[model samples]
Target chain A: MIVTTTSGIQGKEIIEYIDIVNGEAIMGARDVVGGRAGSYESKLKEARDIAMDEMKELAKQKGANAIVGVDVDYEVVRDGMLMVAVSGTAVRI
Target chain B: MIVTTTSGIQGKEIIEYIDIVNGEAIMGANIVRDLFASVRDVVGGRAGSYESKLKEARDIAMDEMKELAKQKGANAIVGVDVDYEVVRDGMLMVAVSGTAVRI
Candidate 1:
Protein backbone atom coordinates (compact mmCIF):
# COMPACT_ATOMS: atom_id res chain seq x y z
CA MET A 1 0.00 0.00 0.00
CA ILE A 2 1.12 3.54 -0.64
CA VAL A 3 0.74 6.49 1.73
CA THR A 4 1.59 10.11 1.14
CA THR A 5 1.01 13.61 2.38
CA THR A 6 0.52 14.80 -1.19
CA SER A 7 -3.01 15.05 -2.50
CA GLY A 8 -2.06 12.83 -5.41
CA ILE A 9 0.88 10.64 -6.33
CA GLN A 10 3.00 11.57 -9.34
CA GLY A 11 2.04 8.69 -11.60
CA LYS A 12 -0.75 6.88 -9.90
CA GLU A 13 -4.26 7.84 -10.88
CA ILE A 14 -6.76 7.46 -8.12
CA ILE A 15 -9.43 4.94 -9.11
CA GLU A 16 -11.75 5.70 -6.22
CA TYR A 17 -11.92 7.99 -3.27
CA ILE A 18 -12.93 6.07 -0.22
CA ASP A 19 -14.00 7.44 3.11
CA ILE A 20 -11.49 9.04 5.42
CA VAL A 21 -9.67 6.84 7.89
CA ASN A 22 -8.43 7.96 11.25
CA GLY A 23 -6.31 6.66 14.10
CA GLU A 24 -5.34 7.91 17.50
CA ALA A 25 -2.69 7.07 20.07
CA ILE A 26 -2.39 8.31 23.62
CA MET A 27 0.58 8.05 25.94
CA GLY A 28 1.39 9.03 29.51
CA ALA A 29 3.02 12.38 30.32
CA ARG A 30 6.45 10.91 30.99
CA ASP A 31 6.21 8.89 27.81
CA VAL A 32 6.26 12.08 25.83
CA VAL A 33 8.09 14.59 28.10
CA GLY A 34 10.93 12.06 28.26
CA GLY A 35 9.60 16.52 25.09
CA ARG A 36 11.33 19.28 23.46
CA ALA A 37 11.24 20.82 20.03
CA GLY A 38 13.78 18.03 19.28
CA SER A 39 15.02 16.34 22.42
CA TYR A 40 12.09 13.94 22.67
CA GLU A 41 11.85 13.17 18.98
CA SER A 42 12.17 9.43 19.46
CA LYS A 43 9.23 9.41 21.83
CA LEU A 44 7.16 11.36 19.35
CA LYS A 45 8.16 8.90 16.62
CA GLU A 46 7.01 5.99 18.73
CA ALA A 47 3.56 7.51 19.22
CA ARG A 48 3.21 8.59 15.62
CA ASP A 49 4.18 5.13 14.41
CA ILE A 50 1.34 3.54 16.31
CA ALA A 51 -1.15 6.09 15.04
CA MET A 52 -0.03 5.82 11.41
CA ASP A 53 -0.01 2.05 11.54
CA GLU A 54 -3.53 1.98 12.89
CA MET A 55 -4.64 4.37 10.19
CA LYS A 56 -3.15 2.15 7.50
CA GLU A 57 -4.89 -0.86 8.90
CA LEU A 58 -8.23 0.90 8.70
CA ALA A 59 -7.52 1.95 5.15
CA LYS A 60 -6.70 -1.64 4.26
CA GLN A 61 -9.95 -2.79 5.80
CA LYS A 62 -11.77 -0.33 3.59
CA GLY A 63 -10.18 -1.95 0.52
CA ALA A 64 -8.03 1.03 -0.20
CA ASN A 65 -4.56 0.52 -1.59
CA ALA A 66 -3.34 3.94 -0.71
CA ILE A 67 -3.97 6.94 1.47
CA VAL A 68 -3.38 10.54 0.45
CA GLY A 69 -3.35 13.98 1.96
CA VAL A 70 -2.38 12.46 5.26
CA ASP A 71 -2.40 14.78 8.23
CA VAL A 72 -1.06 13.94 11.68
CA ASP A 73 -1.65 15.99 14.80
CA TYR A 74 -0.11 15.90 18.25
CA GLU A 75 -1.45 17.47 21.41
CA VAL A 76 -1.16 17.31 25.13
CA VAL A 77 -4.41 15.89 26.40
CA ARG A 78 -5.97 15.56 29.84
CA ASP A 79 -3.60 14.71 32.65
CA GLY A 80 -0.79 15.97 30.46
CA MET A 81 -0.90 12.82 28.34
CA LEU A 82 0.21 13.06 24.74
CA MET A 83 -2.19 12.24 21.95
CA VAL A 84 -1.41 11.58 18.32
CA ALA A 85 -4.21 11.65 15.81
CA VAL A 86 -3.93 10.84 12.11
CA SER A 87 -6.40 11.21 9.29
CA GLY A 88 -6.24 10.63 5.55
CA THR A 89 -8.41 9.98 2.56
CA ALA A 90 -8.21 6.36 1.54
CA VAL A 91 -8.20 5.51 -2.15
CA ARG A 92 -7.57 2.86 -4.72
CA ILE A 93 -4.88 3.73 -7.23
CA MET B 1 16.33 13.51 -1.36
CA ILE B 2 12.75 12.46 -0.72
CA VAL B 3 10.55 13.36 2.20
CA THR B 4 7.29 11.48 2.60
CA THR B 5 4.59 11.09 5.19
CA THR B 6 4.67 7.36 4.69
CA SER B 7 6.78 4.99 6.71
CA GLY B 8 8.76 3.79 3.69
CA ILE B 9 9.26 4.87 0.11
CA GLN B 10 7.64 2.74 -2.53
CA GLY B 11 10.10 0.55 -4.47
CA LYS B 12 12.96 1.74 -2.31
CA GLU B 13 14.77 -0.26 0.34
CA ILE B 14 15.47 1.57 3.56
CA ILE B 15 19.04 0.61 4.36
CA GLU B 16 19.02 2.44 7.65
CA TYR B 17 16.73 4.33 9.96
CA ILE B 18 18.99 7.15 11.08
CA ASP B 19 17.03 9.02 13.73
CA ILE B 20 14.11 11.31 14.36
CA VAL B 21 14.30 14.98 13.58
CA ASN B 22 11.99 17.89 14.30
CA GLY B 23 11.36 21.56 13.52
CA GLU B 24 9.12 24.17 15.08
CA ALA B 25 7.98 27.69 14.35
CA ILE B 26 5.88 30.13 16.31
CA MET B 27 4.08 32.99 14.62
CA GLY B 28 2.20 35.94 15.98
CA ALA B 29 -1.29 36.54 14.76
CA ASN B 30 -2.82 39.92 14.14
CA ILE B 31 -5.96 38.72 15.84
CA VAL B 32 -7.91 41.96 15.84
CA ARG B 33 -7.37 42.82 12.19
CA ASP B 34 -7.56 39.20 11.17
CA LEU B 35 -10.91 38.79 12.83
CA PHE B 36 -12.17 41.96 11.22
CA ALA B 37 -10.91 40.79 7.85
CA SER B 38 -12.44 37.39 8.32
CA VAL B 39 -15.79 38.97 8.99
CA ARG B 40 -15.40 41.39 6.12
CA ASP B 41 -14.49 38.51 3.85
CA VAL B 42 -17.66 36.80 4.93
CA VAL B 43 -19.32 39.93 3.65
CA GLY B 44 -17.22 40.27 0.43
CA GLY B 45 -13.49 39.45 0.31
CA ARG B 46 -11.44 36.23 -0.01
CA ALA B 47 -10.05 36.00 3.55
CA GLY B 48 -7.12 33.89 2.42
CA SER B 49 -4.40 35.74 4.24
CA TYR B 50 -4.77 33.67 7.40
CA GLU B 51 -4.56 30.50 5.39
CA SER B 52 -1.39 31.74 3.76
CA LYS B 53 0.07 32.61 7.13
CA LEU B 54 -0.58 29.09 8.39
CA LYS B 55 0.92 27.60 5.27
CA GLU B 56 3.99 29.79 5.60
CA ALA B 57 4.57 28.57 9.12
CA ARG B 58 4.05 24.98 8.08
CA ASP B 59 6.53 25.39 5.27
CA ILE B 60 9.11 26.73 7.65
CA ALA B 61 8.69 23.73 9.92
CA MET B 62 8.94 21.35 6.98
CA ASP B 63 12.07 23.02 5.68
CA GLU B 64 13.74 22.83 9.05
CA MET B 65 12.92 19.13 9.40
CA LYS B 66 14.41 18.42 5.97
CA GLU B 67 17.56 20.32 6.76
CA LEU B 68 17.97 18.46 10.02
CA ALA B 69 17.60 15.15 8.20
CA LYS B 70 20.24 16.22 5.71
CA GLN B 71 22.59 17.06 8.55
CA LYS B 72 22.18 13.49 9.81
CA GLY B 73 23.57 12.22 6.48
CA ALA B 74 20.18 10.82 5.52
CA ASN B 75 19.02 10.92 1.93
CA ALA B 76 15.34 10.64 2.78
CA ILE B 77 12.80 11.26 5.45
CA VAL B 78 9.69 9.18 6.07
CA GLY B 79 6.73 8.94 8.37
CA VAL B 80 6.63 12.69 8.53
CA ASP B 81 3.96 14.53 10.53
CA VAL B 82 3.17 18.24 10.66
CA ASP B 83 1.28 19.68 13.59
CA TYR B 84 -0.40 22.99 14.27
CA GLU B 85 -1.11 24.43 17.68
CA VAL B 86 -2.63 27.62 18.98
CA VAL B 87 -0.20 28.85 21.60
CA ARG B 88 -2.31 31.75 22.81
CA ASP B 89 -4.93 34.19 21.67
CA GLY B 90 -2.34 35.79 19.44
CA MET B 91 0.10 33.03 18.57
CA LEU B 92 0.22 30.02 16.31
CA MET B 93 2.80 27.27 16.28
CA VAL B 94 3.65 24.70 13.67
CA ALA B 95 5.91 21.75 14.21
CA VAL B 96 7.05 18.95 11.93
CA SER B 97 8.70 15.64 12.72
CA GLY B 98 10.04 12.68 10.76
CA THR B 99 12.40 9.77 10.76
CA ALA B 100 15.57 10.23 8.73
CA VAL B 101 16.61 7.31 6.59
CA ARG B 102 19.25 6.11 4.14
CA ILE B 103 17.65 4.18 1.33
Candidate 2:
Protein backbone atom coordinates (compact mmCIF):
# COMPACT_ATOMS: atom_id res chain seq x y z
CA MET A 1 0.00 0.00 0.00
CA ILE A 2 1.00 3.61 0.61
CA VAL A 3 4.53 4.15 1.98
CA THR A 4 6.90 6.99 2.70
CA THR A 5 10.67 7.17 2.38
CA THR A 6 13.36 9.62 3.42
CA SER A 7 17.08 10.17 3.46
CA GLY A 8 17.14 10.36 7.25
CA ILE A 9 16.00 8.71 10.47
CA GLN A 10 12.78 10.70 10.50
CA GLY A 11 11.73 8.40 7.69
CA LYS A 12 11.85 5.42 10.00
CA GLU A 13 9.76 7.24 12.59
CA ILE A 14 7.21 8.03 9.95
CA ILE A 15 6.98 4.40 9.03
CA GLU A 16 6.71 3.35 12.63
CA TYR A 17 3.86 5.84 13.08
CA ILE A 18 2.06 4.87 9.89
CA ASP A 19 0.50 1.70 8.62
CA ILE A 20 1.73 -0.10 5.48
CA VAL A 21 -0.93 -0.83 2.94
CA ASN A 22 0.89 -3.76 1.34
CA GLY A 23 4.11 -5.74 1.06
CA GLU A 24 7.46 -3.95 1.05
CA ALA A 25 9.69 -3.70 -2.04
CA ILE A 26 13.38 -3.07 -2.52
CA MET A 27 15.24 -2.00 -5.69
CA GLY A 28 18.93 -1.81 -6.45
CA ALA A 29 21.04 0.08 -9.00
CA ARG A 30 21.66 -3.06 -11.02
CA ASP A 31 17.97 -3.49 -11.59
CA VAL A 32 17.87 -0.21 -13.51
CA VAL A 33 21.20 -0.18 -15.38
CA GLY A 34 20.73 0.56 -19.07
CA GLY A 35 24.27 1.76 -19.76
CA ARG A 36 23.38 5.32 -18.77
CA ALA A 37 23.43 7.20 -15.50
CA GLY A 38 20.09 8.73 -16.43
CA SER A 39 18.68 5.23 -16.46
CA TYR A 40 19.45 4.96 -12.78
CA GLU A 41 17.60 8.17 -12.04
CA SER A 42 14.66 7.04 -14.09
CA LYS A 43 14.64 3.71 -12.36
CA LEU A 44 14.64 5.30 -8.91
CA LYS A 45 11.87 7.66 -9.89
CA GLU A 46 9.89 4.83 -11.40
CA ALA A 47 10.37 2.72 -8.34
CA ARG A 48 9.24 5.52 -6.04
CA ASP A 49 6.29 6.22 -8.27
CA ILE A 50 5.28 2.60 -8.17
CA ALA A 51 5.66 2.59 -4.43
CA MET A 52 3.43 5.64 -3.99
CA ASP A 53 0.88 4.17 -6.34
CA GLU A 54 0.76 1.01 -4.31
CA MET A 55 0.50 3.07 -1.16
CA LYS A 56 -2.44 4.94 -2.59
CA GLU A 57 -4.17 1.67 -3.40
CA LEU A 58 -3.65 0.68 0.19
CA ALA A 59 -4.99 3.97 1.43
CA LYS A 60 -8.07 3.39 -0.62
CA GLN A 61 -8.44 0.05 1.07
CA LYS A 62 -8.14 1.72 4.45
CA GLY A 63 -10.45 4.58 3.41
CA ALA A 64 -7.80 7.21 3.78
CA ASN A 65 -7.75 10.53 1.97
CA ALA A 66 -4.28 11.81 2.73
CA ILE A 67 -1.07 10.30 3.99
CA VAL A 68 0.79 12.40 6.53
CA GLY A 69 4.25 12.32 8.05
CA VAL A 70 5.78 10.36 5.17
CA ASP A 71 9.44 9.48 5.24
CA VAL A 72 11.95 7.75 2.97
CA ASP A 73 15.36 6.31 3.79
CA TYR A 74 18.27 5.46 1.48
CA GLU A 75 21.60 3.77 2.00
CA VAL A 76 24.41 2.38 -0.11
CA VAL A 77 24.91 -1.00 1.42
CA ARG A 78 28.13 -2.73 0.34
CA ASP A 79 29.02 -3.05 -3.36
CA GLY A 80 26.07 -2.82 -5.73
CA MET A 81 23.68 -2.39 -2.83
CA LEU A 82 22.19 1.06 -3.27
CA MET A 83 18.83 0.87 -1.57
CA VAL A 84 15.73 2.93 -0.73
CA ALA A 85 12.95 2.38 1.81
CA VAL A 86 9.69 4.33 2.03
CA SER A 87 7.16 4.19 4.83
CA GLY A 88 4.48 6.45 6.28
CA THR A 89 1.42 6.47 8.46
CA ALA A 90 -1.56 5.62 6.29
CA VAL A 91 -4.40 7.59 7.75
CA ARG A 92 -7.77 9.00 6.77
CA ILE A 93 -6.59 12.45 7.71
CA MET B 1 15.99 14.82 36.93
CA ILE B 2 17.81 12.57 34.47
CA VAL B 3 18.09 13.09 30.72
CA THR B 4 19.79 11.39 27.77
CA THR B 5 21.59 12.73 24.72
CA THR B 6 22.79 10.92 21.63
CA SER B 7 24.55 11.54 18.33
CA GLY B 8 22.18 9.50 16.23
CA ILE B 9 18.47 9.20 15.49
CA GLN B 10 18.13 6.13 17.66
CA GLY B 11 19.25 8.30 20.55
CA LYS B 12 16.31 10.60 20.01
CA GLU B 13 14.11 7.55 19.83
CA ILE B 14 15.45 6.45 23.16
CA ILE B 15 14.40 9.76 24.68
CA GLU B 16 11.00 9.56 23.08
CA TYR B 17 10.53 5.97 24.13
CA ILE B 18 11.81 6.27 27.68
CA ASP B 19 10.97 8.40 30.70
CA ILE B 20 13.22 11.23 31.80
CA VAL B 21 14.56 11.69 35.34
CA ASN B 22 16.02 15.18 35.73
CA GLY B 23 16.98 18.68 34.49
CA GLU B 24 18.83 19.63 31.28
CA ALA B 25 22.23 21.19 30.56
CA ILE B 26 24.40 22.14 27.55
CA MET B 27 28.15 21.50 27.50
CA GLY B 28 30.40 22.81 24.75
CA ALA B 29 33.98 22.98 23.46
CA ASN B 30 35.29 26.44 24.39
CA ILE B 31 34.07 25.71 27.90
CA VAL B 32 36.16 22.55 28.02
CA ARG B 33 39.35 24.20 26.74
CA ASP B 34 42.24 23.15 28.94
CA LEU B 35 45.62 24.51 30.05
CA PHE B 36 47.49 22.63 27.29
CA ALA B 37 46.88 21.78 23.67
CA SER B 38 48.03 18.27 24.55
CA VAL B 39 45.10 18.03 26.90
CA ARG B 40 42.94 18.89 23.94
CA ASP B 41 44.93 16.35 21.99
CA VAL B 42 44.23 13.78 24.65
CA VAL B 43 40.53 14.24 24.09
CA GLY B 44 41.40 14.64 20.44
CA GLY B 45 38.67 15.03 17.90
CA ARG B 46 40.18 11.99 16.20
CA ALA B 47 39.50 9.10 18.57
CA GLY B 48 35.83 10.05 19.10
CA SER B 49 36.76 11.23 22.58
CA TYR B 50 36.34 14.79 21.37
CA GLU B 51 32.63 14.42 21.60
CA SER B 52 32.11 17.88 23.04
CA LYS B 53 29.06 18.47 20.92
CA LEU B 54 27.55 15.15 21.87
CA LYS B 55 28.30 15.82 25.50
CA GLU B 56 26.77 19.26 25.27
CA ALA B 57 23.60 17.94 23.75
CA ARG B 58 23.39 15.20 26.32
CA ASP B 59 23.87 17.76 29.05
CA ILE B 60 20.87 19.63 27.77
CA ALA B 61 18.91 16.39 27.74
CA MET B 62 20.09 15.64 31.23
CA ASP B 63 18.73 18.95 32.43
CA GLU B 64 15.38 18.14 30.93
CA MET B 65 15.48 14.65 32.38
CA LYS B 66 16.33 16.05 35.78
CA GLU B 67 13.26 18.23 35.64
CA LEU B 68 11.19 15.27 34.53
CA ALA B 69 12.58 13.12 37.30
CA LYS B 70 11.83 15.79 39.83
CA GLN B 71 8.25 15.76 38.68
CA LYS B 72 8.14 11.97 38.88
CA GLY B 73 9.94 11.90 42.22
CA ALA B 74 13.04 10.06 41.01
CA ASN B 75 16.48 10.20 42.60
CA ALA B 76 18.79 8.90 39.87
CA ILE B 77 19.01 8.27 36.16
CA VAL B 78 19.73 5.11 34.20
CA GLY B 79 20.02 4.05 30.55
CA VAL B 80 20.68 7.55 29.23
CA ASP B 81 21.79 8.73 25.75
CA VAL B 82 24.94 7.06 24.43
CA ASP B 83 25.45 8.06 20.81
CA TYR B 84 27.93 10.15 18.77
CA GLU B 85 28.22 12.63 15.89
CA VAL B 86 31.24 13.48 13.70
CA VAL B 87 30.02 16.28 11.50
CA ARG B 88 32.33 19.22 11.47
CA ASP B 89 30.94 22.77 11.08
CA GLY B 90 27.38 21.63 11.57
CA MET B 91 25.10 21.61 14.55
CA LEU B 92 24.78 18.33 16.39
CA MET B 93 21.77 17.84 18.61
CA VAL B 94 22.11 15.37 21.48
CA ALA B 95 19.71 14.34 24.20
CA VAL B 96 20.43 12.22 27.30
CA SER B 97 17.63 10.29 29.00
CA GLY B 98 17.11 7.61 31.61
CA THR B 99 14.64 6.16 34.01
CA ALA B 100 14.33 7.99 37.31
CA VAL B 101 14.44 5.88 40.39
CA ARG B 102 14.60 6.47 44.15
CA ILE B 103 18.18 6.14 45.25
Candidate 3:
Protein backbone atom coordinates (compact mmCIF):
# COMPACT_ATOMS: atom_id res chain seq x y z
CA MET A 1 0.00 0.00 0.00
CA ILE A 2 1.12 3.50 -0.76
CA VAL A 3 0.97 6.31 1.79
CA THR A 4 1.73 9.98 1.41
CA THR A 5 1.35 13.28 3.20
CA THR A 6 -0.09 14.88 0.07
CA SER A 7 -3.84 15.07 -0.37
CA GLY A 8 -3.72 12.94 -3.50
CA ILE A 9 -1.27 10.62 -5.14
CA GLN A 10 0.17 11.87 -8.45
CA GLY A 11 -1.13 10.25 -11.65
CA LYS A 12 -3.70 8.28 -9.69
CA GLU A 13 -7.39 9.04 -9.51
CA ILE A 14 -9.10 8.32 -6.24
CA ILE A 15 -11.92 5.87 -6.87
CA GLU A 16 -13.25 5.91 -3.37
CA TYR A 17 -12.71 7.83 -0.17
CA ILE A 18 -12.83 5.02 2.31
CA ASP A 19 -12.54 6.52 5.78
CA ILE A 20 -10.18 8.08 8.26
CA VAL A 21 -7.98 5.52 9.94
CA ASN A 22 -5.60 5.92 12.89
CA GLY A 23 -3.00 3.90 14.75
CA GLU A 24 -1.25 4.36 18.07
CA ALA A 25 1.82 2.83 19.67
CA ILE A 26 3.51 3.37 23.00
CA MET A 27 7.12 2.69 23.91
CA GLY A 28 8.65 2.31 27.31
CA ALA A 29 11.93 3.61 28.73
CA ARG A 30 13.78 0.38 28.07
CA ASP A 31 13.45 0.79 24.32
CA VAL A 32 13.66 4.57 24.45
CA VAL A 33 16.91 4.75 26.40
CA GLY A 34 19.78 4.98 23.93
CA GLY A 35 23.30 5.06 25.30
CA ARG A 36 24.81 5.82 21.91
CA ALA A 37 24.86 9.40 20.80
CA GLY A 38 22.73 8.81 17.66
CA SER A 39 20.47 6.03 18.96
CA TYR A 40 17.63 8.39 19.77
CA GLU A 41 16.46 8.41 16.15
CA SER A 42 16.06 4.67 16.09
CA LYS A 43 14.06 4.67 19.30
CA LEU A 44 11.44 6.94 17.82
CA LYS A 45 11.64 5.19 14.48
CA GLU A 46 10.55 1.89 15.97
CA ALA A 47 7.40 3.36 17.45
CA ARG A 48 6.61 5.27 14.29
CA ASP A 49 7.03 2.16 12.20
CA ILE A 50 4.61 0.23 14.36
CA ALA A 51 1.99 2.94 14.24
CA MET A 52 2.28 3.38 10.47
CA ASP A 53 2.12 -0.36 9.86
CA GLU A 54 -0.95 -0.59 12.04
CA MET A 55 -2.60 2.18 10.04
CA LYS A 56 -1.78 0.43 6.77
CA GLU A 57 -3.23 -2.81 8.03
CA LEU A 58 -6.43 -1.05 8.95
CA ALA A 59 -6.66 0.61 5.55
CA LYS A 60 -6.15 -2.70 3.78
CA GLN A 61 -8.89 -4.23 5.89
CA LYS A 62 -11.19 -1.51 4.64
CA GLY A 63 -10.28 -2.33 1.03
CA ALA A 64 -8.16 0.73 0.54
CA ASN A 65 -5.05 0.57 -1.59
CA ALA A 66 -3.54 3.79 -0.40
CA ILE A 67 -3.59 6.30 2.40
CA VAL A 68 -3.34 10.04 1.80
CA GLY A 69 -2.90 13.21 3.82
CA VAL A 70 -1.09 11.24 6.45
CA ASP A 71 -0.29 12.88 9.76
CA VAL A 72 2.05 11.55 12.38
CA ASP A 73 2.18 12.94 15.91
CA TYR A 74 4.45 12.07 18.80
CA GLU A 75 4.22 12.83 22.50
CA VAL A 76 6.35 12.24 25.55
CA VAL A 77 3.78 10.50 27.66
CA ARG A 78 5.90 10.29 30.80
CA ASP A 79 9.45 10.53 31.99
CA GLY A 80 10.64 7.69 29.82
CA MET A 81 7.59 6.69 27.79
CA LEU A 82 6.79 7.84 24.29
CA MET A 83 3.70 7.57 22.17
CA VAL A 84 3.14 7.84 18.45
CA ALA A 85 -0.15 8.34 16.67
CA VAL A 86 -0.67 8.11 12.93
CA SER A 87 -3.74 9.14 10.97
CA GLY A 88 -4.73 9.26 7.32
CA THR A 89 -7.56 9.14 4.85
CA ALA A 90 -7.84 5.67 3.42
CA VAL A 91 -8.68 5.65 -0.26
CA ARG A 92 -9.02 3.37 -3.25
CA ILE A 93 -7.06 4.45 -6.30
CA MET B 1 -16.66 26.13 16.34
CA ILE B 2 -16.46 24.35 13.04
CA VAL B 3 -13.01 22.85 12.51
CA THR B 4 -12.00 20.34 9.88
CA THR B 5 -8.85 18.71 8.58
CA THR B 6 -9.88 19.34 4.99
CA SER B 7 -9.02 22.62 3.33
CA GLY B 8 -12.70 23.44 2.74
CA ILE B 9 -15.76 22.83 4.79
CA GLN B 10 -18.52 20.98 2.93
CA GLY B 11 -21.61 23.01 2.00
CA LYS B 12 -20.19 26.19 3.46
CA GLU B 13 -18.89 29.09 1.46
CA ILE B 14 -15.65 30.38 2.90
CA ILE B 15 -15.84 34.08 2.28
CA GLU B 16 -12.53 35.18 3.72
CA TYR B 17 -9.42 33.27 4.62
CA ILE B 18 -7.99 34.79 7.73
CA ASP B 19 -4.47 34.37 9.05
CA ILE B 20 -3.22 31.11 10.43
CA VAL B 21 -3.73 30.60 14.15
CA ASN B 22 -2.13 28.23 16.59
CA GLY B 23 -2.41 27.10 20.22
CA GLU B 24 -0.29 25.01 22.50
CA ALA B 25 -0.98 23.22 25.76
CA ILE B 26 1.32 21.34 28.10
CA MET B 27 0.15 17.97 29.30
CA GLY B 28 0.16 17.37 33.04
CA ALA B 29 2.79 14.93 34.15
CA ASN B 30 0.70 13.22 36.79
CA ILE B 31 -2.16 12.49 34.43
CA VAL B 32 0.14 11.33 31.68
CA ARG B 33 2.07 8.59 33.43
CA ASP B 34 -0.31 7.29 36.06
CA LEU B 35 -1.85 4.77 33.72
CA PHE B 36 1.22 3.74 31.80
CA ALA B 37 1.58 0.51 33.71
CA SER B 38 -1.78 -0.84 32.57
CA VAL B 39 -2.35 1.42 29.62
CA ARG B 40 -3.84 -1.01 27.14
CA ASP B 41 -7.54 -0.81 26.55
CA VAL B 42 -9.43 -4.03 26.01
CA VAL B 43 -10.83 -3.13 22.63
CA GLY B 44 -8.23 -1.04 20.86
CA GLY B 45 -5.16 -2.37 22.65
CA ARG B 46 -4.15 1.15 23.60
CA ALA B 47 -3.55 2.74 26.93
CA GLY B 48 -7.00 4.02 27.84
CA SER B 49 -6.12 6.73 30.32
CA TYR B 50 -3.12 7.85 28.37
CA GLU B 51 -5.28 8.15 25.28
CA SER B 52 -7.84 10.19 27.18
CA LYS B 53 -5.21 12.55 28.55
CA LEU B 54 -3.75 13.07 25.11
CA LYS B 55 -7.23 13.74 23.80
CA GLU B 56 -7.85 16.18 26.57
CA ALA B 57 -4.72 18.03 25.64
CA ARG B 58 -5.81 18.14 22.04
CA ASP B 59 -9.19 19.46 23.02
CA ILE B 60 -7.66 22.17 25.14
CA ALA B 61 -5.28 23.17 22.37
CA MET B 62 -8.06 23.23 19.78
CA ASP B 63 -10.25 25.35 22.01
CA GLU B 64 -7.50 27.86 22.56
CA MET B 65 -6.91 28.09 18.80
CA LYS B 66 -10.61 28.54 18.14
CA GLU B 67 -10.83 31.25 20.73
CA LEU B 68 -7.92 33.04 19.16
CA ALA B 69 -9.58 32.82 15.76
CA LYS B 70 -12.81 34.20 17.17
CA GLN B 71 -10.94 37.12 18.60
CA LYS B 72 -9.64 37.79 15.08
CA GLY B 73 -13.20 37.81 13.64
CA ALA B 74 -13.15 34.31 12.24
CA ASN B 75 -16.13 32.00 12.28
CA ALA B 76 -14.38 28.77 11.43
CA ILE B 77 -11.03 27.09 10.98
CA VAL B 78 -9.99 24.75 8.21
CA GLY B 79 -7.03 22.63 7.26
CA VAL B 80 -6.33 22.11 10.91
CA ASP B 81 -3.25 20.18 11.96
CA VAL B 82 -2.60 18.78 15.43
CA ASP B 83 0.77 17.73 16.75
CA TYR B 84 2.41 16.53 19.96
CA GLU B 85 5.97 16.65 21.15
CA VAL B 86 8.23 16.75 24.14
CA VAL B 87 8.81 20.34 24.99
CA ARG B 88 10.77 19.68 28.16
CA ASP B 89 12.35 16.70 29.81
CA GLY B 90 9.00 15.23 30.86
CA MET B 91 6.53 17.78 29.58
CA LEU B 92 4.43 17.01 26.54
CA MET B 93 3.32 19.83 24.31
CA VAL B 94 0.10 19.58 22.37
CA ALA B 95 0.07 22.03 19.50
CA VAL B 96 -2.65 22.82 16.96
CA SER B 97 -2.55 24.94 13.83
CA GLY B 98 -5.13 26.01 11.24
CA THR B 99 -6.27 28.80 8.97
CA ALA B 100 -8.99 31.01 10.40
CA VAL B 101 -11.82 31.74 7.99
CA ARG B 102 -15.19 33.40 7.75
CA ILE B 103 -18.04 31.31 6.44
Q: Write the per-residue lDDT of candidate 2 for residues B4-28, one digit (tens) a residue.
A: 1212222223333335443333333
DockQ value of candidate 2 = 0.03
Candidate that scores best on TM-score: 3
Q: Interface RMSDs of all predictions?
A: 9.4, 13.0, 4.5
User: Which digits, one per residue and each the tens of the lDDT, describe model 2 over residues A1-93?
Assistant: 232232224433322222323212335533754634666466567556665666577667767564543545443422244434343445432
Compared with the true structure, the alpha-carbon lDDT of candidate 2 equals: 0.40
State in Å the error of residue B79, model 1: 13
Off by over 4 Å in 1: A30-41, B1-64, B67-94, B97-103
Predicted complexes: DockQ each:
0.07, 0.03, 0.22
Clashing pairs in 1: none
Candidate 1 per-residue C-alpha lDDT over B2-103 given as tens digits, one digit per residue, 9 for 90 to 100:
988776788977666665567766666663235355543454332454454356557667777787789889899887877766543445567787767787
Residue A30 CA error for candidate 2 (Å)?
23
Expressed as tens digits, the lDDT of each residue in B5-102 for candidate 3 is 55665456799998999988765544343553122224643343665666666667877898999999998877777777776656567788989999
Q: What digit string (tens of lDDT, one per residue) describes model 3 on residues A16-93?
A: 666656677888863664534566466467788999988899899999898887898766566567788887777788
What is the C-alpha interface RMSD of model 2?
Answer: 13.0
Best by DockQ: 3
Which 10 consecutive residues of model 1 chain A have the lowest summed lDDT?
Answer: A30-39
| C-alpha RMSD of candidate 1 | 8.7
